[PDB]
Amino acid sequence: REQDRFLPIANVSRIMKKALPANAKISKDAKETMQECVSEFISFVTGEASDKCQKEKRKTINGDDLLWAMTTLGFEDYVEPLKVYLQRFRE
Amino acid sequence: HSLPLARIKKIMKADEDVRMISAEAPVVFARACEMFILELTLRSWNHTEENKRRTLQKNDIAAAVTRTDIFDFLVDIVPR
């Protein structure tokens, strides 16, 4: 279909393989499916952050808003690693 | 970055309510998306090894989704 609205397959696939044993194969179907799951992750997290900005009459989704939304939707295991990453980015 | 920030922004912007986006937000997502892809592929692979197959297939991803709560939002994207 249209791959304009998805993250590129070559980046997603290469990310899948590093998680997997070297002998692993991945169907072209799974690559495509994982492409859609990860793109839905962005929308899901963005929806929540956008809702909170909307409640607070703020017009910008900041980094904190994404982290706050990840915790709200149950991805708190990601949030501390992400903070550390974000500091290495700001320094 | 592993994934392109411009595409990430693109995805964020399909949401009608999104206005401006801090430049840190695609950066947070690039890393966060990685972690998501790693964790979902690993849980999918548990099913692949369970069936003692060597190919990760779509049905493995479908399986991983039902087995963990934080992934409910994905049950319509990959049913079965």
PDB file of C-alpha atoms in Angstrom:
ATOM      1  CA  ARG A   1       0.000   0.000   0.000  1.00  0.00           C
ATOM      2  CA  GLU A   2       1.348   3.450   0.927  1.00  0.00           C
ATOM      3  CA  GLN A   3       4.586   3.346   2.908  1.00  0.00           C
ATOM      4  CA  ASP A   4       4.519   7.135   3.235  1.00  0.00           C
ATOM      5  CA  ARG A   5       2.814   6.943   6.612  1.00  0.00           C
ATOM      6  CA  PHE A   6       4.925   4.159   8.059  1.00  0.00           C
ATOM      7  CA  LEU A   7       8.444   4.078   9.319  1.00  0.00           C
ATOM      8  CA  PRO A   8      10.774   2.610   6.636  1.00  0.00           C
ATOM      9  CA  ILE A   9      10.841  -1.194   6.438  1.00  0.00           C
ATOM     10  CA  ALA A  10      14.651  -1.297   6.172  1.00  0.00           C
ATOM     11  CA  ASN A  11      15.024   0.441   9.526  1.00  0.00           C
ATOM     12  CA  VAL A  12      12.308  -1.656  11.232  1.00  0.00           C
ATOM     13  CA  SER A  13      13.659  -4.931   9.876  1.00  0.00           C
ATOM     14  CA  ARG A  14      17.196  -4.187  10.915  1.00  0.00           C
ATOM     15  CA  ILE A  15      15.922  -3.411  14.386  1.00  0.00           C
ATOM     16  CA  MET A  16      13.994  -6.745  14.532  1.00  0.00           C
ATOM     17  CA  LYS A  17      17.066  -8.827  13.658  1.00  0.00           C
ATOM     18  CA  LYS A  18      19.255  -7.464  16.446  1.00  0.00           C
ATOM     19  CA  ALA A  19      16.731  -8.770  18.925  1.00  0.00           C
ATOM     20  CA  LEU A  20      16.860 -12.168  17.260  1.00  0.00           C
ATOM     21  CA  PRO A  21      19.317 -15.059  17.034  1.00  0.00           C
ATOM     22  CA  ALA A  22      21.559 -14.979  14.002  1.00  0.00           C
ATOM     23  CA  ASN A  23      19.829 -17.993  12.532  1.00  0.00           C
ATOM     24  CA  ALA A  24      16.410 -16.310  12.790  1.00  0.00           C
ATOM     25  CA  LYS A  25      14.388 -15.607   9.669  1.00  0.00           C
ATOM     26  CA  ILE A  26      11.548 -13.104   9.547  1.00  0.00           C
ATOM     27  CA  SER A  27       8.712 -13.311   7.077  1.00  0.00           C
ATOM     28  CA  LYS A  28       8.206 -10.363   4.769  1.00  0.00           C
ATOM     29  CA  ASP A  29       4.743 -10.399   6.267  1.00  0.00           C
ATOM     30  CA  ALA A  30       6.049  -9.960   9.817  1.00  0.00           C
ATOM     31  CA  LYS A  31       8.367  -7.107   8.769  1.00  0.00           C
ATOM     32  CA  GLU A  32       5.331  -5.379   7.278  1.00  0.00           C
ATOM     33  CA  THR A  33       3.212  -6.134  10.324  1.00  0.00           C
ATOM     34  CA  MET A  34       5.829  -4.854  12.724  1.00  0.00           C
ATOM     35  CA  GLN A  35       5.955  -1.723  10.565  1.00  0.00           C
ATOM     36  CA  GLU A  36       2.292  -1.101  11.306  1.00  0.00           C
ATOM     37  CA  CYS A  37       2.506  -1.969  15.017  1.00  0.00           C
ATOM     38  CA  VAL A  38       5.352   0.480  15.635  1.00  0.00           C
ATOM     39  CA  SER A  39       3.562   3.225  13.672  1.00  0.00           C
ATOM     40  CA  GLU A  40       0.482   2.626  15.822  1.00  0.00           C
ATOM     41  CA  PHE A  41       2.659   2.935  18.919  1.00  0.00           C
ATOM     42  CA  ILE A  42       3.547   6.470  17.841  1.00  0.00           C
ATOM     43  CA  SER A  43      -0.077   7.434  17.244  1.00  0.00           C
ATOM     44  CA  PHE A  44      -1.244   5.816  20.505  1.00  0.00           C
ATOM     45  CA  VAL A  45       1.357   7.615  22.601  1.00  0.00           C
ATOM     46  CA  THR A  46       0.865  10.855  20.641  1.00  0.00           C
ATOM     47  CA  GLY A  47      -2.921  10.806  21.136  1.00  0.00           C
ATOM     48  CA  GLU A  48      -2.522  10.661  24.922  1.00  0.00           C
ATOM     49  CA  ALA A  49       0.121  13.417  25.039  1.00  0.00           C
ATOM     50  CA  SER A  50      -1.996  15.551  22.718  1.00  0.00           C
ATOM     51  CA  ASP A  51      -4.991  15.044  24.969  1.00  0.00           C
ATOM     52  CA  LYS A  52      -3.014  16.242  27.991  1.00  0.00           C
ATOM     53  CA  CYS A  53      -1.709  19.288  26.105  1.00  0.00           C
ATOM     54  CA  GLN A  54      -5.335  19.971  25.173  1.00  0.00           C
ATOM     55  CA  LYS A  55      -6.484  19.779  28.794  1.00  0.00           C
ATOM     56  CA  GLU A  56      -3.717  22.161  29.790  1.00  0.00           C
ATOM     57  CA  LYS A  57      -4.393  24.606  26.902  1.00  0.00           C
ATOM     58  CA  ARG A  58      -0.821  24.083  25.705  1.00  0.00           C
ATOM     59  CA  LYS A  59      -0.003  23.941  22.011  1.00  0.00           C
ATOM     60  CA  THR A  60       3.329  22.058  21.971  1.00  0.00           C
ATOM     61  CA  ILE A  61       4.022  18.378  22.604  1.00  0.00           C
ATOM     62  CA  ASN A  62       7.326  18.423  24.502  1.00  0.00           C
ATOM     63  CA  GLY A  63       9.537  15.486  25.341  1.00  0.00           C
ATOM     64  CA  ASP A  64       8.100  15.298  28.864  1.00  0.00           C
ATOM     65  CA  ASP A  65       4.621  14.926  27.494  1.00  0.00           C
ATOM     66  CA  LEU A  66       5.613  11.757  25.575  1.00  0.00           C
ATOM     67  CA  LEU A  67       7.222  10.277  28.705  1.00  0.00           C
ATOM     68  CA  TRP A  68       4.193  11.189  30.792  1.00  0.00           C
ATOM     69  CA  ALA A  69       1.974   9.564  28.180  1.00  0.00           C
ATOM     70  CA  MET A  70       4.121   6.441  28.074  1.00  0.00           C
ATOM     71  CA  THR A  71       3.670   6.034  31.830  1.00  0.00           C
ATOM     72  CA  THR A  72      -0.084   6.629  31.596  1.00  0.00           C
ATOM     73  CA  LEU A  73      -0.484   3.919  28.954  1.00  0.00           C
ATOM     74  CA  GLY A  74       1.653   1.418  30.850  1.00  0.00           C
ATOM     75  CA  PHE A  75       5.096   1.764  29.288  1.00  0.00           C
ATOM     76  CA  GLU A  76       6.819   2.975  32.441  1.00  0.00           C
ATOM     77  CA  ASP A  77       9.595   0.394  31.927  1.00  0.00           C
ATOM     78  CA  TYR A  78      10.701   2.560  28.946  1.00  0.00           C
ATOM     79  CA  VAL A  79      10.576   5.883  30.759  1.00  0.00           C
ATOM     80  CA  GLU A  80      13.685   5.799  32.911  1.00  0.00           C
ATOM     81  CA  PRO A  81      15.907   4.535  30.014  1.00  0.00           C
ATOM     82  CA  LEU A  82      14.395   7.240  27.819  1.00  0.00           C
ATOM     83  CA  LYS A  83      15.167   9.997  30.370  1.00  0.00           C
ATOM     84  CA  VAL A  84      18.825   8.920  30.399  1.00  0.00           C
ATOM     85  CA  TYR A  85      18.855   8.928  26.618  1.00  0.00           C
ATOM     86  CA  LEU A  86      17.269  12.357  26.571  1.00  0.00           C
ATOM     87  CA  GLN A  87      19.945  13.774  28.865  1.00  0.00           C
ATOM     88  CA  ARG A  88      22.717  12.396  26.656  1.00  0.00           C
ATOM     89  CA  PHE A  89      20.951  14.170  23.799  1.00  0.00           C
ATOM     90  CA  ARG A  90      20.699  17.540  25.703  1.00  0.00           C
ATOM     91  CA  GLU A  91      24.291  17.538  26.962  1.00  0.00           C
TER      92      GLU A  91
ATOM     93  CA  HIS B   1      19.083   7.979  14.760  1.00  0.00           C
ATOM     94  CA  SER B   2      17.921   4.455  13.931  1.00  0.00           C
ATOM     95  CA  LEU B   3      14.610   5.757  12.532  1.00  0.00           C
ATOM     96  CA  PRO B   4      13.995   9.002  10.574  1.00  0.00           C
ATOM     97  CA  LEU B   5      12.724  11.900  12.672  1.00  0.00           C
ATOM     98  CA  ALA B   6      10.907  13.386   9.713  1.00  0.00           C
ATOM     99  CA  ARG B   7       8.766  10.285   9.292  1.00  0.00           C
ATOM    100  CA  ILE B   8       8.110  10.196  13.047  1.00  0.00           C
ATOM    101  CA  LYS B   9       6.966  13.812  12.877  1.00  0.00           C
ATOM    102  CA  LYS B  10       4.902  12.872   9.898  1.00  0.00           C
ATOM    103  CA  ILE B  11       3.134  10.177  11.882  1.00  0.00           C
ATOM    104  CA  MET B  12       2.631  12.424  14.883  1.00  0.00           C
ATOM    105  CA  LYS B  13       1.095  15.089  12.635  1.00  0.00           C
ATOM    106  CA  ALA B  14      -1.621  12.815  11.154  1.00  0.00           C
ATOM    107  CA  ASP B  15      -3.378  13.329  14.452  1.00  0.00           C
ATOM    108  CA  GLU B  16      -5.681  16.343  13.791  1.00  0.00           C
ATOM    109  CA  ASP B  17      -5.210  17.682  17.362  1.00  0.00           C
ATOM    110  CA  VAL B  18      -1.432  17.897  17.183  1.00  0.00           C
ATOM    111  CA  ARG B  19      -0.151  21.443  16.795  1.00  0.00           C
ATOM    112  CA  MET B  20       3.574  22.199  17.265  1.00  0.00           C
ATOM    113  CA  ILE B  21       6.005  19.490  18.253  1.00  0.00           C
ATOM    114  CA  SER B  22       9.125  20.102  20.304  1.00  0.00           C
ATOM    115  CA  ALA B  23      12.210  18.919  18.462  1.00  0.00           C
ATOM    116  CA  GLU B  24      12.970  16.547  21.365  1.00  0.00           C
ATOM    117  CA  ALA B  25       9.740  14.657  20.795  1.00  0.00           C
ATOM    118  CA  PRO B  26      10.701  12.814  17.563  1.00  0.00           C
ATOM    119  CA  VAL B  27      14.057  12.106  19.270  1.00  0.00           C
ATOM    120  CA  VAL B  28      12.351  10.511  22.274  1.00  0.00           C
ATOM    121  CA  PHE B  29      10.192   8.490  19.838  1.00  0.00           C
ATOM    122  CA  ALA B  30      13.116   7.243  17.756  1.00  0.00           C
ATOM    123  CA  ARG B  31      14.602   5.599  20.847  1.00  0.00           C
ATOM    124  CA  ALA B  32      11.203   4.583  22.276  1.00  0.00           C
ATOM    125  CA  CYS B  33      10.173   2.968  18.981  1.00  0.00           C
ATOM    126  CA  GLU B  34      13.396   0.934  19.024  1.00  0.00           C
ATOM    127  CA  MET B  35      12.575  -0.382  22.491  1.00  0.00           C
ATOM    128  CA  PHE B  36       9.047  -1.194  21.380  1.00  0.00           C
ATOM    129  CA  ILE B  37      10.282  -3.069  18.293  1.00  0.00           C
ATOM    130  CA  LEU B  38      12.835  -4.968  20.330  1.00  0.00           C
ATOM    131  CA  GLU B  39      10.349  -5.943  22.988  1.00  0.00           C
ATOM    132  CA  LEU B  40       7.573  -6.920  20.616  1.00  0.00           C
ATOM    133  CA  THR B  41       9.882  -8.918  18.345  1.00  0.00           C
ATOM    134  CA  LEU B  42      11.320 -10.782  21.340  1.00  0.00           C
ATOM    135  CA  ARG B  43       7.897 -11.726  22.662  1.00  0.00           C
ATOM    136  CA  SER B  44       6.868 -12.729  19.127  1.00  0.00           C
ATOM    137  CA  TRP B  45       9.978 -14.919  18.918  1.00  0.00           C
ATOM    138  CA  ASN B  46       9.013 -16.769  22.107  1.00  0.00           C
ATOM    139  CA  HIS B  47       5.986 -17.989  20.171  1.00  0.00           C
ATOM    140  CA  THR B  48       8.173 -18.836  17.149  1.00  0.00           C
ATOM    141  CA  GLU B  49      10.450 -21.009  19.295  1.00  0.00           C
ATOM    142  CA  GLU B  50       7.395 -22.476  21.038  1.00  0.00           C
ATOM    143  CA  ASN B  51       6.220 -23.796  17.667  1.00  0.00           C
ATOM    144  CA  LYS B  52       9.898 -24.810  17.085  1.00  0.00           C
ATOM    145  CA  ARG B  53       9.986 -22.777  13.916  1.00  0.00           C
ATOM    146  CA  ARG B  54      12.888 -20.644  12.814  1.00  0.00           C
ATOM    147  CA  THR B  55      10.939 -17.888  10.982  1.00  0.00           C
ATOM    148  CA  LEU B  56       9.236 -15.055  12.843  1.00  0.00           C
ATOM    149  CA  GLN B  57       5.830 -14.886  11.107  1.00  0.00           C
ATOM    150  CA  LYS B  58       2.842 -12.559  11.442  1.00  0.00           C
ATOM    151  CA  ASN B  59       0.959 -15.127  13.516  1.00  0.00           C
ATOM    152  CA  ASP B  60       3.727 -14.950  16.123  1.00  0.00           C
ATOM    153  CA  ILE B  61       3.247 -11.193  16.428  1.00  0.00           C
ATOM    154  CA  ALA B  62      -0.538 -11.704  16.701  1.00  0.00           C
ATOM    155  CA  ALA B  63       0.173 -14.190  19.467  1.00  0.00           C
ATOM    156  CA  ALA B  64       2.529 -11.887  21.431  1.00  0.00           C
ATOM    157  CA  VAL B  65      -0.102  -9.156  21.362  1.00  0.00           C
ATOM    158  CA  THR B  66      -2.814 -11.125  23.162  1.00  0.00           C
ATOM    159  CA  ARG B  67      -0.425 -12.376  25.848  1.00  0.00           C
ATOM    160  CA  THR B  68       0.555  -8.996  27.300  1.00  0.00           C
ATOM    161  CA  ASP B  69      -1.751  -6.283  28.552  1.00  0.00           C
ATOM    162  CA  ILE B  70       0.145  -3.153  27.441  1.00  0.00           C
ATOM    163  CA  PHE B  71      -0.479  -4.268  23.821  1.00  0.00           C
ATOM    164  CA  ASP B  72      -4.331  -4.263  23.767  1.00  0.00           C
ATOM    165  CA  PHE B  73      -4.115  -1.271  21.443  1.00  0.00           C
ATOM    166  CA  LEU B  74      -2.672  -3.648  18.837  1.00  0.00           C
ATOM    167  CA  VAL B  75      -5.351  -6.376  18.829  1.00  0.00           C
ATOM    168  CA  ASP B  76      -7.239  -4.886  15.868  1.00  0.00           C
ATOM    169  CA  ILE B  77      -4.028  -4.243  13.902  1.00  0.00           C
ATOM    170  CA  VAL B  78      -3.109  -7.945  14.108  1.00  0.00           C
ATOM    171  CA  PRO B  79      -6.035 -10.252  14.955  1.00  0.00           C
ATOM    172  CA  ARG B  80      -6.052 -14.085  15.167  1.00  0.00           C
TER     173      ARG B  80
END
